[PDB]
Design a protein around this ligand. Structure first.
Ligand SMILES: *[C@@H]1O[C@H](CO)[C@@H](O[C@@H]2O[C@H](CO)[C@@H](O)[C@H](O)[C@H]2NC(C)=O)[C@H](O)[C@H]1NC(C)=O
Lengths: 42, 43, 96
């Protein structure tokens, strides 16, 4: 984001979602997931 | 399960006999290791 | 019985349903896969009074990342770093 938003910015997601791009954007300090960690699979 | 079956065949001195024999179960150790590779142990 | 084994472990309540043949999730997939052809008994009880601590009991560890699923009765206690991204990093890493 150009400027970070507070919790109000709950953005709704008809788009294919690729989660590897998120790892391509930046490394993460922490990453937890109740769902399986690789994910990218409706 | 590391299943070990064996037979001692004290009968054909020179090499593989070509004889028909059968192995008997001995033990089925519950180790649970993937064991992709193995090696021998010599004295 | 003929040859009987008793497997002892601690899980979360929401994971009790995963210790059964055919189940998936972080436990069935990455900690212990139970065979689909399974004969035996799964006995579970609440241990909040024994295992929990006010500050949090961190002695119990759950595997969250692995490169493949486990086979029946397989155990793997390796702590080698797993790469979650595309970079082949070592040690604690940007995508490790
Ligand atoms: C048993 O060992 C083999 C290798 O000795 C494992 O196969 C490897 O699995 C990883 C992913 O977990 C792959 O990235 C490698 O390319 C595989 N190599 C080979 C030669 O197959 C196998 O996964 C192990 N068994 C289990 C249940 O993990």
């Amino acid at each position: 984001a150009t400027r970070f938003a507070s919790v109000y910015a709950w953005n709704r997601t008809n788009c294919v979602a690729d989660y590897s791009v998120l790892y391509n954007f930046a490394p993460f300090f922490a990453f937890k997931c109740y769902g399986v960690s690789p994910t990218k699979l409706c | 399960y590391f299943k070990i079956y064996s037979k001692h065949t004290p009968i054909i001195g020179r090499d593989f006999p070509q004889g028909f024999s059968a192995l008997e179960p001995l033990v089925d150790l519950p180790i649970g290791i993937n064991i992709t590779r193995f090696q021998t142990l010599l004295a | 019985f003929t040859n009987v084994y008793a497997d002892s472990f601690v899980i979360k309540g929401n994971e009790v349903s995963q210790i059964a043949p055919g189940q998936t999730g972080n436990i069935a997939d990455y900690n212990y896969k139970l065979p689909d052809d399974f004969t035996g008994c799964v006995i579970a009880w609440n241990s909040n009074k024994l295992d929990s601590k006010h500050s949090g009991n961190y002695d119990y560890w759950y595997r969250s990342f692995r490169k493949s699923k486990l086979k029946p009765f397989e155990r793997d206690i390796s702590t080698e770093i797993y790469q979650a991204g595309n970079k082949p990093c070592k040690g604690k890493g940007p995508n490790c």
